[PDB]
Design a protein around this ligand. Sequence first.
Ligand SMILES: CCCCCCCO[C@H]1O[C@H](CO)[C@@H](O)[C@H](O)[C@@H]1O
Ligand code: NA
Length: 158
Amino acid sequence: FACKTANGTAIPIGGGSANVYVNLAPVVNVGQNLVVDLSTQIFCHNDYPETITDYVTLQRGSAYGGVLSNFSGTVKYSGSSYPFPTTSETPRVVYNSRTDKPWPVALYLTPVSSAGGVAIKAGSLIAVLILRQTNNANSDDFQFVWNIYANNDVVVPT
Ligand SMILES: CCCCCCCO[C@H]1O[C@H](CO)[C@@H](O)[C@H](O)[C@@H]1O
Ligand code: NA
């Protein structure tokens, strides 16, 4: 089991960390949400699907930068909604092919009344998402750590 971003930045068997750079709507009013889909940019696969079933959770999601200070959030994982920042681990998604399959995570962020300016800074860390992988074969229990960076400034009009 290993993962990589859409541009091929990889985390190998056993886990580790990688950076993910996301485009963000450049102007978000206080009545709109800022949506950060990560499923189009984070992918994983199973290295021995003939035998092993891999199980993958969102173990934790933490907010940084302007997302932490200027937005409130939820995260959807595999079609279910949770608070963001998270409070506990989600249920599992199965990975059962050597072909890359998306990691089904997206953030839904709402400006808080204080927002703001600049609401999110280009190049800044905005989230850290921990993917936890186990299987039905052995003791492997690995963290894949995704550091999410904003590509661009986001302005919240006032
Ligand atoms: C004849 C025994 C072959 C043994 C191959 C084990 C490969 O293990 C790797 O790939 C497995 C399948 O993705 C993962 O469940 C495991 O955590 C690790 O990432
Ligand atoms: Na990418």
